[PDB]
């Protein structure tokens, strides 16, 4: 769909059978979700944001449904203030910035 | 334009007479620019996200041209690695997310 930026671009995603709300974020390289239990072996990874670097659990090849569009990719889980869908999954659902 | 997200959406901006590269960030509510010595009255602010919080100076009514599109609004200046164009200015250049 076309999403305007007057409000935060929050979307319902479905991941691990759970629905959640997440921010469509073109400023994020990765998709990083609040601490949740996900299936799979995960590796620790460190990522940075505006405030510094945090350690996250990296899960690969996870299926995520973002507004009904399917993506299968890496999901990072850790202490983020908000679930963010980053560019690794936004490209899979064909999302672009336009103006 | 239509910007795909295979790479970070970096764009040229002009603020206070200087040309800068800045990230179009739909996740950011407000624009936050790297340390720069702008004229004006400013107010102390703390903004946070992954990794914690950084202290920034808030300037208001600052004109910015983002890809030759004029906008004007609040700019936070603080120790960020990347200039971030947030929703407060992206809404003014009519920027939209589409998929």
């Amino acid at each position: 769909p076309q999403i305007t930026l007057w409000k935060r671009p929050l979307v319902t995603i479905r991941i691990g059978g759970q629905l959640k709300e997440a921010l469509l974020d073109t400023g994020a390289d990765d998709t990083v979700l609040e601490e949740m239990n996900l299936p799979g072996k995960w590796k620790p990874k460190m990522i940075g944001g505006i405030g510094g670097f945090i350690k996250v659990r990296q899960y690969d090849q996870i299926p995520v449904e973002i507004c009904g569009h399917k993506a299968i990719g890496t999901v990072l889980v850790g202490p983020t203030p908000v679930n963010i869908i980053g560019r690794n999954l936004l490209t899979q659902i064909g999302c672009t910035l336009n103006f | 334009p239509q910007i795909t997200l295979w790479k970070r959406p970096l764009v040229t901006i002009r603020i206070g007479g200087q040309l800068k590269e800045a990230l179009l960030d739909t996740g950011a509510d407000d624009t936050v620019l790297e340390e720069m010595n702008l004229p004006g009255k400013w107010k102390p602010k703390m903004i946070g996200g992954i990794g914690g919080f950084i202290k920034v100076r808030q300037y208001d009514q600052i004109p910015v041209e983002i890809c030759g599109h004029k906008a004007i609004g609040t700019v936070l200046v603080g120790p960020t690695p990347v200039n971030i164009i947030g929703r407060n200015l992206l809404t003014q250049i009519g920027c939209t997310l589409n998929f």
Partner: peptide, 4 residues
């Protein structure tokens, strides 16, 4: 791996 930067996430703003």
């Amino acid at each position: 791996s930067l996430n703003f």
